[PDB]
């Protein structure tokens, strides 16, 4: 199974940036996906989560207006659309897989 | 090009009556019950939703020494029996019987249930019985009838598919043998191969195959040997609506609903299966105990019994009542009832009485003809001047010693005498 | 002024039998289920409540090289096929099937509920299934049939209407394509456009359009190309009475009730929607597997298949039974049942066998004629001596290689031989 983040760089404050994630080895359209970032102080925080179909998304209040998680089930890809970022959002962004569609979103990220 | 039998099989005025005595079979309605013997005094599976396929063997009309040499000459003509009349007798009274399962996969009542809602975690399997769909059918031929059913088809490609995925469904034609299970309202499929649960349908069929006659294939037959007489009459409705427990293999598309406030909520089970029911059984809709006269067949074979045999497929679910016999466990019962002091047994009964009117026929073995018969079945000429059907299980009916020319001595014979 | 085709199209004794083999389709009964490939090994939406629209392509009788030049001369006469007999074959056994929704908008039982009353605050949506209205229909033409349905009509005037108001309802006619949804007991409308709830009707139709054949418009057609043979047979009844949650857009007039002592009482939900039901399915009410002979059509076009094509719309909900296939998630099941160790799939199956008897006809291309044909369809003369219907989805049935003059070789051919 492979979850590969990609995209795109280190960018100016107040500007946009799109993050991609390619999945392999499992039915991507069957699982709910999530973004988890690790601050430079090495603390892990939950960033976003999207349903198996790209219809249901939810975030913390700290990122409610800036970030937009999306997914392409035909391409087996996960996206995080960040915009007007501040310096406090500096982090190592991780692409994680949660529970499948036939389970309540139990919120543990195995992969 | 296949040719109608009315062009190369001339008929005579010689008519015979043939009939079995009363045929009956008792057994268990749900499954074969083995009892260690003295092998074996077991009771067989005798269900009202079973195909009854009688293999009726007729006496060789060429070897028959009753007709005189005025009817035919054994130089260019040969004899063959032609079926004209059929009456299928049914014995037991009309009744409705149940088939069930103690661990039926019933999750939630979806037919306006305000009682409660069941949790999927624990073993949510209820003890459920049901009265099956009502079916009366009758097919007469000289070749076993062809039925269709869905089975676990072979792998689509040389492709490794994940365990738990839905297997491919393949429609399959098979000869209908005596004892096969009929469509009961859950479809015509291989429940043993397509349901590893062993809990979706009652015990009658949970490990069996339900076959439905392929009327489309038998009617499009070239020669029409499979079926030259067919009577169907079936009815069913949905009595109760239920839910199936188990993880949904097909993801419910999120375009078709709105999840509500709990945006991380698992959608409830959306695999709905109704309980079938055959509604009222009435003698007005009865289809047997009646004489049926075959004049024109549906196919080109017009009721000609090649190889002096005749296959009769019949299903009658209008007598599905089940006898409940119970015996006390004490030698004599103490006059106090406790369920532990009584053994309960379920037995089912089937009773038939087959009657036939056959017509003797000549076949002038010309050229063009006979070569046509050779292209039809070489074994026809071979038997005149092994068995491929012994691989299948039939109910044997030997009528070689049961033919009689005194038609007025038998009920079907008299009813046939009202046809001059 | 339009003229009957029996006045300028002379008929011949040349008859042909044409028939497709067995047609079958399996899939999901409620929705298309995409599976990521290797695009695509997905299962399609195969519902018993779907329109089956076959586009039967016929061989060009002028290009036909089997009849001799004695039947007609290609100097002032041209040939066209005319349909005479039709038999629609249905394969699977009769059954009733359910369609449901896990989040169905069911507030309170409004029939005779003494259980309790539900609170409106939370998500008061129950898991509800239902057996749809029973519908059998058949329409034969040379142009796809015309159906009607209700849609969200365009704004009445250049008027800004408030969000949440009831949109105007507009009746719309559209050609009936293969796969369209039939009326199921909730009406013939665009549920996707008129119900933002996505929770008023089952998953079968909650995001689809239910179309009903516009018999009034097709029968009032000038030429009668849309429908020259029509058989309908539908039945339905109200099984359960329910209430719909959601704020009432129409204010209940205070002239129609008395509020009681609590002069603050919110009027209960007064939008009542019943659960339809198709009652018993019986083979006595069956409408297919029978030969139908077209002599006089309803319109002026008397079964003439212009452009050598024939459109057959058919709906049969009497075989709506659903196969339930489940596969274990463990490679082999440990002999212990838990709902998490079985994947459940619902598959549906449709089987047809179309049969036709066509008659060869002549058209002497006089003046008055041909000019009448030109005013009818210029493309008729143009094709004699592109296509607007490929924008629609049909089930293609190619019978150019299946025409045969040996009528006695086919069942419908023999049944037609009982017509001399």
PDB file of C-alpha atoms in Angstrom, chain A residues 29-30 51-58 101-106, chain B residues 247-251 254 257-259 262-267 270:
ATOM      1  CA  UNK A  29     -12.875   5.489  -3.149  1.00  0.00           C
ATOM      2  CA  UNK A  30     -13.933   3.226  -0.253  1.00  0.00           C
ATOM      3  CA  UNK A  51     -15.593  11.347   3.320  1.00  0.00           C
ATOM      4  CA  UNK A  52     -15.215   8.406   0.940  1.00  0.00           C
ATOM      5  CA  UNK A  53     -17.093  10.471  -1.608  1.00  0.00           C
ATOM      6  CA  UNK A  54     -15.948  14.070  -1.765  1.00  0.00           C
ATOM      7  CA  UNK A  55     -19.273  15.341  -0.419  1.00  0.00           C
ATOM      8  CA  UNK A  56     -18.560  15.531   3.334  1.00  0.00           C
ATOM      9  CA  UNK A  57     -15.559  17.425   4.701  1.00  0.00           C
ATOM     10  CA  UNK A  58     -14.721  18.715   8.158  1.00  0.00           C
ATOM     11  CA  UNK A 101     -17.404   3.713   4.154  1.00  0.00           C
ATOM     12  CA  UNK A 102     -19.148   0.835   5.967  1.00  0.00           C
ATOM     13  CA  UNK A 103     -17.825   2.002   9.360  1.00  0.00           C
ATOM     14  CA  UNK A 104     -18.524   5.052  11.465  1.00  0.00           C
ATOM     15  CA  UNK A 105     -15.649   7.470  10.949  1.00  0.00           C
ATOM     16  CA  UNK A 106     -13.730   6.047  13.898  1.00  0.00           C
TER      17      UNK A 106
ATOM     18  CA  UNK B 247     -21.301  -5.081   5.702  1.00  0.00           C
ATOM     19  CA  UNK B 248     -22.530  -3.593   2.436  1.00  0.00           C
ATOM     20  CA  UNK B 249     -20.153  -4.618  -0.331  1.00  0.00           C
ATOM     21  CA  UNK B 250     -21.426  -1.886  -2.660  1.00  0.00           C
ATOM     22  CA  UNK B 251     -20.831   1.660  -1.457  1.00  0.00           C
ATOM     23  CA  UNK B 254     -23.313   9.866  -1.554  1.00  0.00           C
ATOM     24  CA  UNK B 257     -28.801  10.995   0.232  1.00  0.00           C
ATOM     25  CA  UNK B 258     -27.917  13.661   2.789  1.00  0.00           C
ATOM     26  CA  UNK B 259     -26.097  12.430   5.877  1.00  0.00           C
ATOM     27  CA  UNK B 262     -23.673  13.639  12.314  1.00  0.00           C
ATOM     28  CA  UNK B 263     -21.515  14.048   9.220  1.00  0.00           C
ATOM     29  CA  UNK B 264     -19.511  10.920  10.149  1.00  0.00           C
ATOM     30  CA  UNK B 265     -22.550   8.613  10.408  1.00  0.00           C
ATOM     31  CA  UNK B 266     -22.565   5.170   8.828  1.00  0.00           C
ATOM     32  CA  UNK B 267     -25.657   4.771   6.597  1.00  0.00           C
ATOM     33  CA  UNK B 270     -29.758  -0.762   2.425  1.00  0.00           C
TER      34      UNK B 270
END
